[PDB]
Amino acid sequence: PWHHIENLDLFFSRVYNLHQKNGFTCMLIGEIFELMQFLFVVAFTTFLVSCVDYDILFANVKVTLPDAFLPAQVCSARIQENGSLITILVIAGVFWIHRLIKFIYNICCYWEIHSFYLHALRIPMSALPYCTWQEVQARIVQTQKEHQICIHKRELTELDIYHRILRFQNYMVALVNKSLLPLRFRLPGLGEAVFFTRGLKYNFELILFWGPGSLFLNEWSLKAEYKRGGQRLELAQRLSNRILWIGIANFLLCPLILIWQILYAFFSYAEVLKREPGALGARCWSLYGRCYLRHFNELEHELQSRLNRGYKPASKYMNCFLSPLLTLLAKNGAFFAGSILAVLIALTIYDEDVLAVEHVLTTVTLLGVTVTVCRSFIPDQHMVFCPEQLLRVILAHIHYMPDHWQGNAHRSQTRDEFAQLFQYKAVFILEELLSPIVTPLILIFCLRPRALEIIDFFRNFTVEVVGVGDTCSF
Amino acid sequence: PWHHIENLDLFFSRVYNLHQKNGFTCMLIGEIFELMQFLFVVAFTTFLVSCVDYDILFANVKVTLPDAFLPAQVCSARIQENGSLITILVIAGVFWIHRLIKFIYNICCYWEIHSFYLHALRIPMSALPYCTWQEVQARIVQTQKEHQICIHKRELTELDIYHRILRFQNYMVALVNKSLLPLRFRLPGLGEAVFFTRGLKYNFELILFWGPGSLFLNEWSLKAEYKRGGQRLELAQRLSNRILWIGIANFLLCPLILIWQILYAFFSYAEVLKREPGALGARCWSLYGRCYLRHFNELEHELQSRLNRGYKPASKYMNCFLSPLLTLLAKNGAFFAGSILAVLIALTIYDEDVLAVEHVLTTVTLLGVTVTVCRSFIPDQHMVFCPEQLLRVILAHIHYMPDHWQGNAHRSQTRDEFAQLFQYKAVFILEELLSPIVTPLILIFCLRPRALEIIDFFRNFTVEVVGVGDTCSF
Amino acid sequence: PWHHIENLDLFFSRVYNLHQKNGFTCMLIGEIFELMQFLFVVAFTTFLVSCVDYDILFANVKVTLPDAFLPAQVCSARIQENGSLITILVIAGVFWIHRLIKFIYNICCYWEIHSFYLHALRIPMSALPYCTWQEVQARIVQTQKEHQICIHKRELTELDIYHRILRFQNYMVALVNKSLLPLRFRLPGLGEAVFFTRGLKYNFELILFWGPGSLFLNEWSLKAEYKRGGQRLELAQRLSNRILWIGIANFLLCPLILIWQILYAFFSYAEVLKREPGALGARCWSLYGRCYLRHFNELEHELQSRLNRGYKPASKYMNCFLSPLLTLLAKNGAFFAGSILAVLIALTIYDEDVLAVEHVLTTVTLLGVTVTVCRSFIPDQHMVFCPEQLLRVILAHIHYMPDHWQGNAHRSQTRDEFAQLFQYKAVFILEELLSPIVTPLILIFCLRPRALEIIDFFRNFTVEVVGVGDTCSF
């Protein structure tokens, strides 16, 4: 049954994702909840926009919650009469319909992959969350005589699976580390800024890999016309028109994507700020650090493991960088604020009628917040300031660092250059919000003039591995 | 003075316990508070049952606490007229009287031991909490010519003290690790369940060691009739009647012991749930792990040290076992719950008259609890899932593990088999509550048919160390 | 320009302090805020004493904060009419005027030092917080031919800078470790007490080093009359009169210094008790541990580093010392208190009208505090009591320990002797409050009779390093 496939690339990617999804039911259940998140976001916002009145809620006998909710009939009439609301719902509906159809097709294709694990590999569906990818890899390669998926190539190789699954991610890796993508900016008042988000990466792969107008012929071979240097300018002009058109589509989609990014950050992170706002000060590896620190032919879990082992030294390293002025001001401000708040607390503690004076509680509240915030920049008085050993621990995991980091490991410039590989989480959120606005501008003015250079790139750094196809240079 | 003892076994146990009690006053003070805990439990429950009225408390001028308390005369009349309350108090009184008489006798016997530390060993009572058992051991054995406690045996030996103190605990160890005690069960809806509590261990030692009808003649020699195989069936029948009778006593005592176990768990753990309920999710070594992981000839502190060194790796190991479905549901539920709660919090934060709507606070409260509970099953996104090194650290301390744990260290079955050696604290509490109900059933139907096998056991695995007596096989 | 200095001692101290102050602006900004702290303390207390009325605050329409504040005119009239308040303000004004004049002079002298870093060393003012003292040390010593600050001595040496900056701190070190200063006391009800504060150290340096009547001629040479033993008694009598006079000045200043110490502890620590009172239970290295554990020729940062590396093992070591009686009482008290509080919480949880009974909340509140306090003396049940390895880790950093600590590392006496080198923070605060009262008594009765011994000391342990001057013996 596993002979007429013709799409071994997509097949191996699906074989890997089911292992990364911890079986079949979790993938199905995970996909359903993904679809449900969008629908819930849309429905709750729509319900909040139309049904609830907010008049009898602010009161302008105890009132129940169901009173503020309008009955179904009047809520439907206000939705279908907003005009400026139904036009967003229509677009948010067609994307989900496309997604749902794609999902149904993927289920019917992942069920076929399920049989291949069960039958060809003899690995039950209850042992997946306990089977490393290495175990799955040995049974696929050693039994390649039975299922005879690839008879065309003389044999199958471990390097082949890595190349087949990751034919386009290697291309993505080569573009960012050769500065062939517009991800460096100079800003007035900020200085150097690296703006690399998921929209640009999604757009790069859509411009270069996916679509009927991309550089790749079917799935695993870029069009032969891109292997001849006789029409570099003509191909560049054609690519420039393509790049220009994709940017126009992004500019058209700007308002919709902005609503989606805003809604996602709010529904996902606007509650952690209330309960534990220090979690958004905790740092995480940025998307550039995932493409700058990524080896060639390295799967998602092999890289995620390295970013996990180097997560605790990185928090310490970024936390040993203080500021003589910030530390001075924090020390002094905490003293002054706490010295006033202590008197206030004593007058409050003795007789509590002071709590009825107008601006006593707010002053105490803001000062408690002020003391706690200011006392958070004051380090532990007996810490071992060792910001030189911290880089050793980090480099032992992520494996990549600019050459001007080893000696001067403690300057304020090295921290500001490391903070771009290891960014705040709050900063991460903020540039996910700005991605749908800046991404089109980046593609039209910065990437379009490079449309020639890319054409040279794809022409000079693409080799042809026999039996595999057109792959990216290491 | 230390020549006419005739009970060197009990003497050495008392010598050890005073060191484990950190001197003499602490033992006296500890015993008094132990007696006082029972009396307080009984008295407070009795006072709550009879004196307080709960009528003028629920209000059916500010009211004081002493108003709800009835005067002594009317409270005494209601106690001595309850009938169904005085019959429990009588039993709770006679046990304490027995305990108090035993305590007074033990004090007069521990005072004699106090003189032996002070005079024979020349160790002051202010240096006990700072003297290891090794220091006490060297001065006892090296000065065995002066106090001449044991002249019968040619000399005294360190192995002898371990054997003399622990003649019955070794027997307890051999029964659990040879599955000679009924502590394995199959339950519909739960599967495998190991139910081993203090009542069974107390009952085992009462059936086998203590009492005038046990297997041991005086204190340190089982009756010679149990060394002849000519009457195995007859001895088994006699033992079966004994086992049957002990079970009947337990069945009779079931309601009383149940009240004691319920009261003890409530008074000891029902407040930690309110303040810090995560402490009852913290795991602890179960009573079977104390008998399965216990070496032979190992005192209480030597084992407690090993269970201490292996406590932190064990919490990590049991905490690295997740569930693809539980983690998926938690992630998704937290998002949905937090997404609703964030909107609620914003409407609450803007104008607080929303706080007067009926079901807004309860929804917020349950959802905050829901988010916090659900967000507690979501691991740290950058943790080093290394559940294989954790078993190495644990095995280096407790020294005992089933053979099918080394290879498959990460299956869901190994965790469910390790959770029986290292059980939850909440689970520990729950099976202490169920011990007085299930313990009689275990003894009558499961241990009684084994009454023959035990007779064989005690006949084949009991050696006679010269000068020491009848000991258990290692 | 760096030739006519004549005060190389003060110059090198200033060169070091600017590095310890992380540049020039931070020193200027730090000094200004230091001056501002005193002024704010005085002004706020004065404003609180005179302006606010506390009559319309305790209420004896919602009332604003500005109503309680008296207008400027009536507040000025009450200040300048208090009599017993203006006499304190005058003294608190003249000290600050002296301080401000000294500060202005130091700025004009540190600006000259700023040019020496910028020009002679070619080290910009933006690289100071990132330059170790070693980098500053190499450029000073290797370029000693250009600025020719010291041509008198043949060359400059690293030992010379250490000696020049720290000519008086070495003297302070030799007096405390030879028990030549009155810092040991026997108290009824407390026993041994080591009372060494900043006032005594400040007074010691004022009696011995600073002033026109001290032992040192100009700055770096004690008067030659103190190098001849022919007038030991006469010099001792003169020194005794000096010591007596300094003590009289301290006794006169007792009330003022007491107000300053009280105010400083309150404004600095009286708020941490409210928010996080466990931070004042955290220990810190006492002032005697800074003079007992200090090497010879060791700068402030080299010692602070050692006190930082040995801070975490020291907290563990002092936290592994329990008390059999304290642990027993805590266990039992927590059980009893929690057993009552659990019943109270259940009655409170079922129906909340119980919250209106008078003494229910206070009982719950005090018992919650009681449980939390008592449950703070109860250690973790599975901790590795290893108070012997902890001393190894500590001694590896502070380098100094009494000889009767190595063997008996766990007695209650070693802890009570280590607690004097590593004292509580709350204890530290308390003896800073008592320093202005006890310091004069210590100098008059204990140090005055020693006035002879000191004269012998300064005569026998002062060597003359050529080119450097009169230094202290190592």
Whether A134 contacts A299, CB under 8 Å:
no
Whether C283 contacts A381, CB under 8 Å:
no
Residues A434 and A338 occupy one common structural domain:
no
* B411/A29 Cβ within 8 A: no
Residues A114 and A17 occupy one common structural domain:
yes
In a 3-state reduction of DSSP, which class is residue C9?
Answer: helix
User: C275 contacts in A (CB within 8 Å)?
Assistant: 368, 371-372
Element (H, E) at B463: strand B462-465
What's the sign of the alpha-carbon dihedral C280, C282, C283, C284? Answer: negative
Min distance C424 CA to chain B CA atoms (Å): 24
Q: For residue A353, what is the nearest residue in chain C, using CA coordinates? A: C58
* C129/A324 Cβ within 8 A: yes
In a 3-state reduction of DSSP, which class is residue C216?
Answer: strand
* A410/C130 Cβ within 8 A: yes
What residue type is B251 in one-letter code?
F
CA dist., res. A456 & res. A235, Å (int): 10
Residue given tokens 């070594």 in the structure block: B285
Backbone angles phi, psi at C463, to 5 degrees: -105, 165
Nearest to A317 by CA among A384, A265, A368, A362: A384
CA dist., res. A468 & res. C388, Å (int): 64
Residue C442, classified by CB atoms within 10 Å of its CB into exposed (0-12), middle (13-18) or buried (19+), is buried
Residue C415 in any domain: the answer is yes
Residues C399 and C439 occupy one common structural domain:
no
For testing contact with chain B, the best of A22, A126, A271 (most B CBs within 10 A): A271
Peptide-bond breaks in chain A following residues (C–N over 2.5 A):
60
Residues C108 and C12 occupy one common structural domain:
yes
Enter the resolution in angstroms. 4.0
CA dist., res. B427 & res. A335, Å (int): 49
Backbone angles phi, psi at A16, to 5 degrees: -70, -40
Residue given tokens 């000191």 in the structure block: C454
Q: For residue A385, what is the nearest residue in chain C, using CA coordinates? A: C305
Gyration radius of chain C over CA positions: 28
CA dist., res. C417 & res. B309, Å (int): 29
* Facing residue for B62 by CB, picked from C332, C341, C356: C356
Q: For residue C385, what is the nearest residue in chain B, using CA coordinates? A: B305
* Facing residue for C382 by CB, picked from B48, B68, B307: B307
What's the sign of the alpha-carbon dihedral A228, A233, A235, A240? Answer: positive
Residues B74 and B123 occupy one common structural domain:
yes
Check CB contact of A271 with chain B, cutoff 8 Å.
yes
Q: Which residues are within 8 A (CB) of A284 and not within 5 positions of it... i.e. 6 or more apart? A: A422, A423, A425, A428, B381, B382
Min distance C379 CA to chain B CA atoms (Å): 12
Distances (CA, A) of C93 to A256, C81, C96, C248, C254: 66, 17, 5, 22, 17
Distances (CA, A) of C255 to B207, C198, C249, C262: 77, 17, 11, 11
Answer with the one of B114, B133, B165 that is the final residue of a domain.
Answer: B165
The half-sphere exposure of A131 on its side-chain side, counting CA atoms within 13 A, is 21
Residue A234 in any domain: the answer is yes
What residues of chain A, 68 to 107, have a C-beta less than 8 Å from chain B?
68
Q: How many CB pairs under 8 A join A and C?
A: 82
Residue C294 in any domain: the answer is no
Min distance A160 CA to chain C CA atoms (Å): 50
* A342/C267 Cβ within 8 A: yes
Domain assignment of residue B88, given as a range? 8-165
Q: For residue C264, what is the nearest residue in chain A, using CA coordinates? A: A339
Q: For residue A414, what is the nearest residue in chain C, using CA coordinates? A: C130
Residue A207 in any domain: the answer is yes
Residue B380 in any domain: the answer is no
CB count, 10 Å around CB of B415?
A: 16
Whether B467 contacts B152, CB under 8 Å:
yes
Whether B284 contacts B459, CB under 8 Å:
no
For testing contact with chain A, the best of B320, B322, B332 (most A CBs within 10 A): B332
* B272/C338 Cβ within 8 A: yes
Whether C271 contacts C231, CB under 8 Å:
no
Nearest to C250 by CA among C394, C437, C94, C65: C437
Residues B58 and B202 occupy one common structural domain:
no
DSSP C221-283: SB-GGGG-GGGHHHHHHHHHHHHHHHHHHHHHHHHHHHHHHHHHHHHHHTTHHHH-GGGGTSE
Residues A249 and A335 occupy one common structural domain:
no
Pair type for strands A469-472 and A422-424 = unpaired
Nearest to C298 by CA among C445, C405, C163, C122: C163
User: C68 contacts in A (CB within 8 Å)?
Assistant: 357
Residues A141 and A210 occupy one common structural domain:
no
Min distance B311 CA to chain C CA atoms (Å): 6
User: A58 contacts in B (CB within 8 Å)?
Assistant: 351, 353-354
* Facing residue for B411 by CB, picked from A36, A37, A130: A130
User: Helix/strand/coil (H, E, C) string of chain A?
Assistant: CCCCCCCHHHHHHHHHHHHHCCCCHHHHHHHHHHHHHHHHHHHHHHHHHHCCCCCCCCCCCCCCHHHHCCCHHHHHHHHCCCCCCHHHHHHHHHHHHHHHHHHHHHHHHHHHHHHHHHHHCCCCCCCHHHCCHHHHHHHHHHCCCCCCCCCCCCCCCHHHHHHHHCCCHHHHHHHHHCCCCCCCEEECCCEEECCCCHHHHHHHHHHHCCCCCCCECCCCCECHHHHCHHHHHHHHHHHHHHHHHHHHHHHHHHHHHHHHHHHHHHHHHCCHHHHCHHHHCCEEECHHHHHHCCCCCCCHHHHHHHHHHCCHHHHHHHCCCCCHHHHHHHHHHHHHHHHHHHHHHHHHHHCHHHHHCCCCHHHHHHHHHHHHHHCCCCCCCCCCCCCCHHHHHHHHHHCCCCHHHCCCCCCHHHHHHHCCCEEEHHHHHHHHHCHHHHHHHHHHHHHCCCHHHHHHHHHHCEEEECCCEEEECC
Residue A298 in any domain: the answer is no
Residue C282 in any domain: the answer is no
CA dist., res. B457 & res. B276, Å (int): 46
Looking at C320-452, which runs of residues are DSSP E strands?
Answer: 422-424
* C359/B64 Cβ within 8 A: yes
Q: Per the structure, how many domains does chain A have?
A: 3
In a 3-state reduction of DSSP, which class is residue B222?
Answer: strand
Instruction: Annotate B318-332 with b (16+ C-beta within 10 A) or e (fewer).
Output: bebbbebeeebebbb
Tokens of C352: 């909340």
Residues A67 and A148 occupy one common structural domain:
yes
Tokens of C396: 């590896």
What residues of chain A, 314 to 333, have a C-beta less than 8 Å from chain C?
323-325, 328, 332
Residue A392 in any domain: the answer is yes
Residues B144 and B203 occupy one common structural domain:
no
Please give the DSSP secondary-structure letter assigned to residue C28.
H
CA dist., res. C368 & res. A58, Å (int): 38
Please give the DSSP secondary-structure letter assigned to residue B280.
G
In a 3-state reduction of DSSP, which class is residue B422?
Answer: strand
User: C411 contacts in B (CB within 8 Å)?
Assistant: 130
Check CB contact of C385 with chain A, cutoff 8 Å.
no
Answer with the one of A410, A426, A442 that is the final residue of a domain.
Answer: A426
Nearest to C469 by CA among C4, C7, C2: C7
Residues C408 and C320 occupy one common structural domain:
yes
Check CB contact of C366 with chain B, cutoff 8 Å.
no
Residues B159 and B178 occupy one common structural domain:
no
What residues of chain A, 13 to 52, have a C-beta less than 8 Å from chain B?
22-23, 25-26, 29-30, 33, 36-37, 40-41, 44, 48
Answer with the one of C124, C150, C165 that is the final residue of a domain.
Answer: C165
Check CB contact of A151 with chain C, cutoff 8 Å.
no
What residue type is A138 in one-letter code?
A
Whether B201 contacts B443, CB under 8 Å:
no
Min distance A53 CA to chain B CA atoms (Å): 12
